[PDB]
Amino acid sequence: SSFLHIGDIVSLYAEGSVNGFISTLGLVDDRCVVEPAAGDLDNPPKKFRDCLFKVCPMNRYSAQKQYWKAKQTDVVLLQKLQHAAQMEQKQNDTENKKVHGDVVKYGSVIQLLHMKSNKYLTVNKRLPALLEKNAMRVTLDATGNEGSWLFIQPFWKLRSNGDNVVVGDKVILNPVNAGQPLHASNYELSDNAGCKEVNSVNCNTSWKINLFMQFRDHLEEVLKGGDVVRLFHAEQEKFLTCDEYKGKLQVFLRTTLRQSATSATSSNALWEVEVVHHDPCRGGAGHWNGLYRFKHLATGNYLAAEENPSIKYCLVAVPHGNDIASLFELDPTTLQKTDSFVPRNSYVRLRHLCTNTWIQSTNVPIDIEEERPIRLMLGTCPTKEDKEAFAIVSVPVSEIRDLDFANDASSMLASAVEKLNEGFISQNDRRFVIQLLEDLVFFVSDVPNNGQNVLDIMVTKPNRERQKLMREQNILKQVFGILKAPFRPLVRLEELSDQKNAPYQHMFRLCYRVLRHSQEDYRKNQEHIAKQFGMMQSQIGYDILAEDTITALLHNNRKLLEKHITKTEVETFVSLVRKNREPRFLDYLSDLCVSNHIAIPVTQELICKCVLDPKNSDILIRTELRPVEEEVWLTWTDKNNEHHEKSVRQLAQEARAGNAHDENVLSYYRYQLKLFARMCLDRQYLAIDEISQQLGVDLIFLCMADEMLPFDLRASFCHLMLHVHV
Amino acid sequence: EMGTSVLIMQPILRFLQLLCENHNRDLQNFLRCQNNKTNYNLVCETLQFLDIMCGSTTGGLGLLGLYINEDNVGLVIQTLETLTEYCQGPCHENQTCIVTHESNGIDIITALILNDISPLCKYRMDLVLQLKDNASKLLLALMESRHDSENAERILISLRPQELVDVIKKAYLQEEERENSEVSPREVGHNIYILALQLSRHNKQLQHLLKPV
Amino acid sequence: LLEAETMQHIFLNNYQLCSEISEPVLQHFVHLLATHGRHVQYLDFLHTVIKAEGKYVKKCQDMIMTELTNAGDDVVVFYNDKASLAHLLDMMKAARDGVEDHSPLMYHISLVDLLAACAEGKNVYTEIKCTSLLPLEDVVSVVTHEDCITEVKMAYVNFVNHCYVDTEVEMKEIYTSNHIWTLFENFTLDMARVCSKREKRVADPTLEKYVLSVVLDTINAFFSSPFSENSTSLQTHQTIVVQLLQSTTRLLECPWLQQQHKGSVEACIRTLAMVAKGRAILLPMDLDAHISSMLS
Amino acid sequence: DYLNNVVSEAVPFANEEKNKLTFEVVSLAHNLIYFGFYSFSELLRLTRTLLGIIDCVTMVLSRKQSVFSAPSLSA
Numbered sequence A: 001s002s003f004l005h006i007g008d009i010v011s012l013y014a015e016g017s018v019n020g021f022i023s024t025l026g027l028v029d030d031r032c033v034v035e036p037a038a039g040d041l042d043n044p045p046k047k048f049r050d051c052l053f054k055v056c057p058m059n060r061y062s063a064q065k066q067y068w069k070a071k072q073t074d075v076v077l078l079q080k081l082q083h084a085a086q087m088e089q090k091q092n093d094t095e096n097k098k099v100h101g102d103v104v105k106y107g108s109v110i111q112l113l114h115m116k117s118n119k120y121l122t123v124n125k126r127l128p129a130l131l132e133k134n135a136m137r138v139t140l141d142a143t144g145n146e147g148s149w150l151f152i153q154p155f156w157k158l159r160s161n162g163d164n165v166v167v168g169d170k171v172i173l174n175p176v177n178a179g180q181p182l183h184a185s186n187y188e189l190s191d192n193a194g195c196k197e198v199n200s201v202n203c204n205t206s207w208k209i210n211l212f213m214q215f216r217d218h219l220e221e222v223l224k225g226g227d228v229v230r231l232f233h234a235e236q237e238k239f240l241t242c243d244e245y246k247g248k249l250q251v252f253l254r255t256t257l258r259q260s261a262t263s264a265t266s267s268n269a270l271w272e273v274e275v276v277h278h279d280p281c282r283g284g285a286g287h288w289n290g291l292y293r294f295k296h297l298a299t300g301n302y303l304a305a306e307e308n309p310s311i312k313y314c315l316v317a318v319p320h321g322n323d324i325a326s327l328f329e330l331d332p333t334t335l336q337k338t339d340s341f342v343p344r345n346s347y348v349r350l351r352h353l354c355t356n357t358w359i360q361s362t363n364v365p366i367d368i369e370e371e372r373p374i375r376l377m378l379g380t381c382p383t384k385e386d387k388e389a390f391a392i393v394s395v396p397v398s399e400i401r402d403l404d405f406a407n408d409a410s411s412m413l414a415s416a417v418e419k420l421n422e423g424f425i426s427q428n429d430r431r432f433v434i435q436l437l438e439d440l441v442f443f444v445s446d447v448p449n450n451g452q453n454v455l456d457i458m459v460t461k462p463n464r465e466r467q468k469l470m471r472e473q474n475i476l477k478q479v480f481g482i483l484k485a486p487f488r489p490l491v492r493l494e495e496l497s498d499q500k501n502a503p504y505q506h507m508f509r510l511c512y513r514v515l516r517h518s519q520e521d522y523r524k525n526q527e528h529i530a531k532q533f534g535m536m537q538s539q540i541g542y543d544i545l546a547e548d549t550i551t552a553l554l555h556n557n558r559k560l561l562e563k564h565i566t567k568t569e570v571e572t573f574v575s576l577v578r579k580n581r582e583p584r585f586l587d588y589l590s591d592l593c594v595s596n597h598i599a600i601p602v603t604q605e606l607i608c609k610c611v612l613d614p615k616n617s618d619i620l621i622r623t624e625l626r627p628v629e630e631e632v633w634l635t636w637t638d639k640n641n642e643h644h645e646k647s648v649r650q651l652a653q654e655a656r657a658g659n660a661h662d663e664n665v666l667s668y669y670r671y672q673l674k675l676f677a678r679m680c681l682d683r684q685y686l687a688i689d690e691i692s693q694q695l696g697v698d699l700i701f702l703c704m705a706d707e708m709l710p711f712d713l714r715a716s717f718c719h720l721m722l723h724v725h726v
Numbered sequence B: 001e002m003g004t005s006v007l008i009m010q011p012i013l014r015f016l017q018l019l020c021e022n023h024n025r026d027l028q029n030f031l032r033c034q035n036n037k038t039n040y041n042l043v044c045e046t047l048q049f050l051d052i053m054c055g056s057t058t059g060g061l062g063l064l065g066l067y068i069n070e071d072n073v074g075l076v077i078q079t080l081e082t083l084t085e086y087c088q089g090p091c092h093e094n095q096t097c098i099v100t101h102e103s104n105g106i107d108i109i110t111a112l113i114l115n116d117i118s119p120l121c122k123y124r125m126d127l128v129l130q131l132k133d134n135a136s137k138l139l140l141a142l143m144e145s146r147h148d149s150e151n152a153e154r155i156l157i158s159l160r161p162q163e164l165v166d167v168i169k170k171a172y173l174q175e176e177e178r179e180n181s182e183v184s185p186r187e188v189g190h191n192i193y194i195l196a197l198q199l200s201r202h203n204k205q206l207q208h209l210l211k212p213v
Numbered sequence C: 001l002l003e004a005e006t007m008q009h010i011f012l013n014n015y016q017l018c019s020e021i022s023e024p025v026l027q028h029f030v031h032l033l034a035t036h037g038r039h040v041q042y043l044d045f046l047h048t049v050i051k052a053e054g055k056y057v058k059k060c061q062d063m064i065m066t067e068l069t070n071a072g073d074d075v076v077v078f079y080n081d082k083a084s085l086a087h088l089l090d091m092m093k094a095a096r097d098g099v100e101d102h103s104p105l106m107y108h109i110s111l112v113d114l115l116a117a118c119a120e121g122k123n124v125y126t127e128i129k130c131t132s133l134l135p136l137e138d139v140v141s142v143v144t145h146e147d148c149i150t151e152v153k154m155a156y157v158n159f160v161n162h163c164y165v166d167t168e169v170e171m172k173e174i175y176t177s178n179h180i181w182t183l184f185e186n187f188t189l190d191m192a193r194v195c196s197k198r199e200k201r202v203a204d205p206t207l208e209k210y211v212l213s214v215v216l217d218t219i220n221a222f223f224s225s226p227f228s229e230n231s232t233s234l235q236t237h238q239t240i241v242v243q244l245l246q247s248t249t250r251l252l253e254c255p256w257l258q259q260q261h262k263g264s265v266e267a268c269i270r271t272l273a274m275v276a277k278g279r280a281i282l283l284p285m286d287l288d289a290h291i292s293s294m295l296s
Numbered sequence D: 001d002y003l004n005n006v007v008s009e010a011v012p013f014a015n016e017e018k019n020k021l022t023f024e025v026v027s028l029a030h031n032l033i034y035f036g037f038y039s040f041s042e043l044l045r046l047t048r049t050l051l052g053i054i055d056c057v058t059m060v061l062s063r064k065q066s067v068f069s070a071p072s073l074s075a
């Protein structure tokens, strides 16, 4: 037995109305629940890391509360309040460092910080619990507030105020402000099966504190049970991976083409180390003599050894680690301090206790069928080789938290996509989707959220890890589904401007902003997103910010521009401009023609064929000379099939007088010359011949000489003369 | 309006001040501590009251002016005077307790001397001038006979030299405010300059700054 | 529930109390509405404090609007979705003979009335805040339904008058949309129904009050506002103006019109007349002569 | 003639459209000069106007080999 101290990692087990461990539903949700069927004290739940909390001292939020109030409802006052809040945060951190290791006594204030989410538990007296109206609400808050304060009180008459709290003692957690003890109610959440709400209300429930890890053991210089680690084979310089090959999970060594093998990091390579202890709920720092198990984070399976089909034993993944087979033992590869704790980032040799065989890497690929196999089989052999050693590389907790957040966000967006596909989505669900999309924007952009508008975010340097997580965790696929499903009954592009569709409009702009942010300086993500170029084009012309994403994707990317552009893209562009007869679309064609101020031969030829084809000539204004010496005349055909013909001088006069039709026609003509000139850049003879046939040297000279014509029109004609003829 | 509990402090503070009048070391020590089974220090409680009224760290961070208002300015001055009475005599233990208290009341006193209460000063300059005078008197009493520089070091930590040099200059240039004022701003500036010399004896930067052109 | 009535009576026509009501009282009432449940007594207490001695308290309005919108789906309950609208219609069909006391329908009506009252000060903050909660589309959908009682119709018309029409800032939806015109058509239908009912030696006091209190004021506010003289979109619709003119003048022609509420009616005519000459719309010979009889 | 007109007027860069037209004109002059159309005497009679223009009172960037480079026998 021992006395609970500040900074210890413990798990709370209610045994009142319902018996179970308090935990959370995820990182994107702020609900705390108890699952009786998940496990018991003797058999802890499989996902035990979700039930662990840290005890922290009382913190001051007065200045922070004042700053929040000021934000809710001059500039110098706000700056002073922000400085006061920052000073309060620093003082709280210093005090927490000071009181670290102190013994907890009944009647004191203790805050429970969830380890997985890094959010303090909080009781709100101003809100009612969702399932039970009488009880107050309990939620997780990252920043924290006065509601997080909790009194630990004796549930047993033997314990008295001022006594030292002893591990394994049932206690009562009373919110300081609310004053109503927490309670594991019997109400069951609709969305989650078997999970019961936790709410603040008078009850008889008691929480049995179990010490998962002591404060002294909580040091980052040692290998601690529950840590997420990566196994790296030094000899082959490969990371151990577990993934489904055909229909079953297999363990192998992935092959990487990157310059640095260590730089290659993937989610499937993450393993969790669990130290075997007499107490099922006890972790603690590991020792060389102590046994260990490795659990796959993504799938939850446990590594073990099985009969080899043909290398007597082969490494595999089994659903349950309770079996004795999963047990493993570690052997040092260098001198150690009298068999002290295993150091962090230390090379070790793994052995199977049941078989007494040591691990070994085999060259026999697991995916020989694939053109470029990347999976190498591993096997356990009785003989030990000093070369065959797997190093354990510690992963920062921040990376694990980001991965969990990405997975939870992907799941929630998949649920939202399913709801939209069904055709009906609740307003509250839509608001939750909007909030999660804003959080994703701020998460990918890697910029602190200080009230700045989410839509307009500028990032000095992209975070490669965040973008890789976005691609790997399928978040981009869920975003594409979010964009596709609503438009194809639920909402129409033309109806987006309507006030009724304003929230959907905001959702779509947020999605496009996410896509734009995710693909900055990333070839793989750029290709993955550009695979939906047709869908992006389908949404062009509406206030959905698709133009920004389209421009960014193809901006200063010659390889991407060449690969992802074909005749179909130009066909869509020309169809759209024909539908709208808008010069901006010709401007888009011209931008497509040239990238980085250098002509792209392939897309240039494609646009050459598409624009100058006999079909689509209706959108293309025609220029002629009339003796009336000779005056230049422009003939244009509207989408209604009506043909109009007017002299260039007459068109300029009409534009000067303010005629909207003639001015729009002249702007379209100017963009037509821009497109033609870009078509003829870098000595493109194919279009040069056609344009010279359409416009001659004398005609261009006459147009550019006449001062009555618009100055910009003369500039465009001079540009065309410089490119095509000179 | 002030609550009854806060209101009752003023007579208590005045009574404690009267007890320690005439530099009675015996009563000052008795108030600070007593030969009792359970000892209750009154000077620390007075410093805590001043800190809470002034906002403690929040007030010392430049927000002192907002908390102080005309309604409780009298109580603030009363507690400052009570602290001065505790310190004067001089009393080594009372001054050490006030300077080195956990609440950091000395930070509030330094902010009071250095940071003018904008709201009160805008419509009532005389109250702010009197409050600054009282704070300067308290600080002077704290180092009446403190040969050790630890108290001066604490004050300097809570108070940079340049701000005292500037404040002394302003107080000299603030004499125009003496009109319809009982306390001369220049007199308060002179007292602050004497305190600045006392600090300069320990601080080189303040000594250099205090030297005229 | 018994203390709410006493609290309301304490502040009842007491401006010096209502204008000085402290925030904790309003917060406690709002929390009771949220946590304890949805009861009409709290809404009545909130409403009675906004207006005291005729004068409107801007403060209490601002805090009530700020706190009410914070809690949603428990305090400010609205029926805007198709399923919610169907449930509202199902509940209303049982109230054809009259809204039952303490029923959810009366709670909804009281909530709408309180929201409309909170915006009866030409405010710029509360109006925009409540515009989003109840869009004009839902208002027109619930008002134009054939099976609609007079209470909810009056509440919605008062809301769309004080929250939408009578505002300090321009609203795009009201003028640049074909929404208020359906409301005007429904108003003309209501006037015709009033005429028919009175011709049958029968009358509904609630319907008469609705037709003589809110609809006329709503029309006057719509047609006598700085943003209406522009008539950017009013030019397209001209027949509805003539229909309203003829309906209102015919209603005036009836002798049963009590004097107290005649003025506004007449005023409406004048306003419409001021529009007609501006809009150059066609006028019937008989109607034109009848209007000109009193134009000068 | 256009370069002469631009140099003749004071504060030539005032009317944005005229700045665009002047950009086009100078681009044409540059291209012709590097093609060798202008004669050396014509080149001087032109550089007088260009110096006057910069005298104290649809955009694509293309850069060839640094022109401000000393000519060399072997490149």
Ligand SMILES: O=P(O)(O)O[C@@H]1[C@H](O)[C@H](O)[C@@H](OP(=O)(O)O)[C@H](OP(=O)(O)O)[C@H]1O
Pocket: A255, A256, A257, A258, A264, A265, A468, A523, A524
């Ligand atoms: O150098 P580039 O052009 O950026 O390409 C990167 C790298 O060269 C590999 O293609 C790939 O590593 P693997 O073969 O190990 O996947 C990596 O994917 P990653 O982003 O998934 O690490 C790419 O980003």
